[PDB]
Amino acid sequence: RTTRDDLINGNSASCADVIFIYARGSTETGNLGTLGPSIASNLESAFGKDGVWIQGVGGAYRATLGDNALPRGTSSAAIREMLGLFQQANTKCPDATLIAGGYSQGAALAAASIEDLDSAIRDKIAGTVLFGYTKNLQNRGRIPNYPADRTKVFCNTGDLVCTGSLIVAAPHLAYGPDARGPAPEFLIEKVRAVRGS
Ligand SMILES: *[P@@](=O)(CCCCCC)OCC
Numbered sequence: 268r269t270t271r272d273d274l275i276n277g278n279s280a281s282c283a284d285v286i287f288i289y290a291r292g293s294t295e296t297g298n299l300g301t302l303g304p305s306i307a308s309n310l311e312s313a314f315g316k317d318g319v320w321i322q323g324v325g326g327a328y329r330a331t332l333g334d335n336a337l338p339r340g341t342s343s344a345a346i347r348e349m350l351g352l353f354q355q356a357n358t359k360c361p362d363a364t365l366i367a368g369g370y371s372q373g374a375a376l377a378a379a380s381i382e383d384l385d386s387a388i389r390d391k392i393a394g395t396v397l398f399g400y401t402k403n404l405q406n407r408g409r410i411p412n413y414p415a416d417r418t419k420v421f422c423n424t425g426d427l428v429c430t431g432s433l434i435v436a437a438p439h440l441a442y443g444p445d446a447r448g449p450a451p452e453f454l455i456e457k458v459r460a461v462r463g464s
Contacts (some may be wrong), residue, residue, distance in 0.1 A: 268304060269297030270394060273320035274356055282360035283320040285310070288352050290324040290345075290373030292399070293332040298323025300330075302370050302446040309451035310366075313460075320363075322356075324349045330372060335433050340375025340401045344398040349380035354450055357388045364462055366454045371428065375401045382411040393417060394457030396450045398442040404431040410441065421445045421455045 274286055287310055291300030299307065299321075307321040328345040339346065356365055365388075369377030374397035381389055395410060397403075398421045408420050422429035425438035 268324050269295075269299045269323075270325070271297075271299055271307060271321040271323050272304075272325070274322035274359065276351065277320050277359065279359045281315075282315075282363055284363060284462065285319040285320055285366060286322065286356045286360060286363045287319060287366045287368070287454070288322050288349070288356065289367065290326065290328065290349060290369035290376045291330055291369035292373050293330050295330055295370075298325035298328075300370065300373070302442055302450075303368075305446040306368060306396075306451050306454070309447070310454065313451070313455045320360075322352060322377065324352060324373070328376065330433060332372075335372050335375070335401060339379040341379060345376050346379050346383065346425070349376055350383060352386050353380065353384055353388050353392075354388075357391065363391075364458050365392045366394050366458060367392050368398075368450065368454070370398040371401060371439065374398060378402055378406065378410045381413050386412075389413065393461050394419070394454050396453060397421065398445060398450070399423070399426055399428055399439050401428045401433070403429040417457060419450070420448065 289303045327348040334342045396419045423438035427434040
């Protein structure tokens, strides 16, 4: 449900073909929060339960609201945690195609992590989805050092965090439909683009 640790719990002798690493929003529960489970269910439908590993960013990532104000939009500890998961994926399952996502603070975390990542690992992330991207204006809708064609940003009209503010208005909490349809649709398309079908 809201907690998935498929990568950490997974057997390297039986690696999934696709590994999804997701960071939740501020104050959300488990390691997937409100949007992660919806995306996970659709990925499982497309690749099969054993074909995809769902991994939320837990550990040191406390999803503390105040951390949105820090330089990178999240804490250094959180960035270290997500980088560690990408590194664990690369080591445990070198042939797996990676995909990533994040919501709100988790989107800033995903962007910061991907920016700092070793290029050889970053290049294995076939697609990344960001909801209510807090650094949308600052980064011009991009993730530094990562291609635009592999990036999809969902920023609602009226969601102030997408326009350079840290105010939480109603549109910031309305990404449900995107997580149920277009976000997994994009991730599936990007994985099939490189893996075939
Ligand atoms: P997001 O981190 C919230 C918006 C960040 C700006 C507020 C200071 O997660 C929503 C639960």
